[PDB]
Amino acid sequence: TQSLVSSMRGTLDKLKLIKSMTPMYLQQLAPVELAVIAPMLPFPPFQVP
Amino acid sequence: SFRVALAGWLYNGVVTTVIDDSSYPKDGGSVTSLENLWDFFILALALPL
Secondary structure: OOOOHHHHHHHHHHHHOOOOOHHHHHHHHHHHHHHHHHHHOOOOOOOOO | OHHHHHHHHHHOOOOOOOOOHHHOOOOOOOOOOHHHHHHHHHHHHHOOO
């Protein structure tokens, strides 16, 4: 019954411009952490492409 | 609501004044109803502000 265009647009922009550093962590540091602990695991990795 | 509407003229950039949904007829109305005719009159006179 009322326009929500301004409210929806404002909320989405805040989500898009959030100062989250998780994508930074996953791309750079997460692979290194997986690599260092992989040889020490009791069950060595088993992967398919 | 009258003087609120007059005040709202200075801030149409961030605030948009609209008529509330409850002012409209509940089921749309019918021209065979005097009450609905009065509803139309009231809404028509109130909208242009």
